[PDB]
Tab-separated table of C-alpha atoms in Angstrom:
chain	number	residue	atom	x	y	z
A	1	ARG	CA	-17.323	-42.026	54.785
A	2	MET	CA	-16.675	-38.515	56.002
A	3	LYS	CA	-13.719	-38.036	53.672
A	4	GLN	CA	-16.750	-39.768	50.297
A	5	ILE	CA	-18.892	-37.037	51.694
A	6	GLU	CA	-16.227	-34.267	51.301
A	7	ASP	CA	-14.951	-35.382	48.058
A	8	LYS	CA	-19.530	-35.462	46.809
A	9	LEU	CA	-19.424	-31.886	48.354
A	10	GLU	CA	-16.365	-31.049	46.145
A	11	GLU	CA	-17.841	-32.326	42.811
A	12	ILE	CA	-21.590	-29.967	44.506
A	13	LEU	CA	-19.197	-27.155	44.645
A	14	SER	CA	-17.885	-27.855	41.020
A	15	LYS	CA	-21.394	-28.113	39.540
A	16	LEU	CA	-22.043	-23.991	41.966
A	17	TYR	CA	-18.849	-23.027	39.769
A	18	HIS	CA	-20.641	-24.166	36.799
A	19	UNK	CA	-23.748	-21.368	38.616
A	20	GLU	CA	-20.785	-18.797	38.393
A	21	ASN	CA	-19.859	-19.700	34.677
A	22	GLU	CA	-23.519	-19.488	33.209
A	23	UNK	CA	-24.214	-16.317	35.293
A	24	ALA	CA	-20.696	-14.413	32.637
A	25	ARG	CA	-22.699	-16.133	29.796
A	26	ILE	CA	-25.929	-14.666	30.593
A	27	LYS	CA	-24.606	-11.347	31.738
A	28	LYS	CA	-22.882	-11.574	27.390
A	29	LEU	CA	-26.495	-12.091	26.439
A	30	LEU	CA	-28.126	-9.401	28.695
A	31	UNK	CA	-24.719	-6.682	30.568
B	1	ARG	CA	-26.747	-41.598	59.089
B	2	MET	CA	-23.719	-41.046	56.768
B	3	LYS	CA	-24.910	-43.295	53.868
B	4	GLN	CA	-29.023	-40.570	54.726
B	5	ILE	CA	-26.533	-37.789	54.237
B	6	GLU	CA	-25.220	-39.036	51.029
B	7	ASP	CA	-28.281	-40.099	49.391
B	8	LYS	CA	-29.807	-35.750	50.785
B	9	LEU	CA	-26.457	-34.803	48.757
B	10	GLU	CA	-27.606	-36.816	45.839
B	11	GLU	CA	-31.193	-35.521	45.571
B	12	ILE	CA	-29.033	-31.332	46.144
B	13	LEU	CA	-27.005	-32.596	43.062
B	14	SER	CA	-30.398	-33.526	41.215
B	15	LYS	CA	-32.057	-30.292	42.240
B	16	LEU	CA	-27.753	-28.338	40.573
B	17	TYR	CA	-28.983	-30.405	37.426
B	18	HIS	CA	-32.526	-28.730	37.380
B	19	UNK	CA	-29.475	-25.334	37.564
B	20	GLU	CA	-28.284	-26.897	34.267
B	21	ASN	CA	-31.648	-27.425	32.624
B	22	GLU	CA	-32.898	-23.950	33.509
B	23	UNK	CA	-29.741	-22.192	32.571
B	24	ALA	CA	-30.573	-24.356	28.530
B	25	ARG	CA	-34.031	-23.024	28.824
B	26	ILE	CA	-33.017	-19.556	29.612
B	27	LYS	CA	-30.173	-19.461	26.972
B	28	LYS	CA	-33.865	-20.569	24.109
B	29	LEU	CA	-35.242	-17.263	25.524
B	30	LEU	CA	-31.881	-15.143	25.224
B	31	UNK	CA	-28.847	-17.609	22.838
C	1	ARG	CA	-23.698	-33.555	64.679
C	2	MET	CA	-24.970	-35.714	61.775
C	3	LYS	CA	-28.578	-35.075	62.327
C	4	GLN	CA	-26.779	-30.617	62.706
C	5	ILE	CA	-25.465	-31.434	59.261
C	6	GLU	CA	-28.753	-33.014	57.733
C	7	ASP	CA	-30.765	-30.117	59.146
C	8	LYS	CA	-27.427	-27.363	57.175
C	9	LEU	CA	-28.330	-29.527	54.177
C	10	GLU	CA	-32.146	-28.739	54.532
C	11	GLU	CA	-31.719	-25.140	54.925
C	12	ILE	CA	-28.932	-25.754	51.137
C	13	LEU	CA	-32.039	-27.326	49.708
C	14	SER	CA	-34.302	-24.394	50.779
C	15	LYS	CA	-32.077	-21.777	49.581
C	16	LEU	CA	-32.091	-24.530	45.753
C	17	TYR	CA	-35.807	-24.033	46.155
C	18	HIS	CA	-35.194	-20.262	46.116
C	19	UNK	CA	-33.107	-21.581	42.380
C	20	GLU	CA	-36.647	-22.791	41.446
C	21	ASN	CA	-38.588	-19.708	42.611
C	22	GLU	CA	-36.229	-17.149	40.720
C	23	UNK	CA	-35.733	-19.392	37.728
C	24	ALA	CA	-40.661	-18.775	37.732
C	25	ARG	CA	-39.692	-15.119	38.186
C	26	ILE	CA	-37.173	-14.677	35.366
C	27	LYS	CA	-39.160	-16.953	32.979
C	28	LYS	CA	-42.359	-13.750	33.936
C	29	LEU	CA	-39.634	-11.355	32.827
C	30	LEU	CA	-38.431	-13.270	29.579
C	31	UNK	CA	-41.119	-16.770	29.050
D	1	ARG	CA	-14.451	-34.156	60.339
D	2	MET	CA	-18.131	-33.318	60.981
D	3	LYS	CA	-17.338	-29.896	62.191
D	4	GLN	CA	-14.705	-29.838	58.431
D	5	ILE	CA	-17.922	-30.812	56.643
D	6	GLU	CA	-20.075	-28.311	58.207
D	7	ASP	CA	-17.642	-25.604	57.718
D	8	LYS	CA	-17.590	-27.196	53.121
D	9	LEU	CA	-21.227	-26.568	53.737
D	10	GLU	CA	-20.785	-22.860	54.919
D	11	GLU	CA	-18.428	-21.928	52.130
D	12	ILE	CA	-21.604	-24.078	49.423
D	13	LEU	CA	-24.091	-22.026	51.356
D	14	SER	CA	-21.880	-18.799	50.552
D	15	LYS	CA	-21.009	-19.695	46.771
D	16	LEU	CA	-25.872	-19.994	47.095
D	17	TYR	CA	-25.700	-16.546	48.250
D	18	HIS	CA	-23.652	-15.549	45.205
D	19	UNK	CA	-27.325	-17.305	43.380
D	20	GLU	CA	-29.101	-14.552	45.265
D	21	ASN	CA	-26.416	-11.641	44.396
D	22	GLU	CA	-26.610	-12.526	40.641
D	23	UNK	CA	-30.345	-13.353	40.482
D	24	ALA	CA	-30.543	-8.935	42.224
D	25	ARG	CA	-28.127	-8.221	39.356
D	26	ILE	CA	-30.102	-9.939	36.359
D	27	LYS	CA	-33.519	-8.866	37.959
D	28	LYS	CA	-31.333	-4.797	37.131
D	29	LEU	CA	-30.749	-6.016	33.752
D	30	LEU	CA	-34.413	-7.282	33.097
D	31	UNK	CA	-37.050	-6.203	36.525
């Protein structure tokens, strides 16, 4: 269950990287 | 407690999807 | 340690609510 | 593994502080 929790936290970190990707996209629209 | 933690992580993932919807709403205002 | 982890996840959820607060403030600047 | 999970949660919180850094930078482009 700890190693299910770590691999939920990895796919939270992936959906923060998708944070990062939108924040280059908005900074084209605004930068 | 592990399967309480996994179901806090699910309702963090839900509030990243609300990330996603706001980052659609801001791209109507800016796109 | 599980109920330390749950209360790190509470203070991640709080800093997603600060997500919501800024996505109110940017939507004043743009809405 | 609990104290591996807490230290994934710290490096999630760090990548939320980077939320905070960008939401200073966009609030220069817009404020």
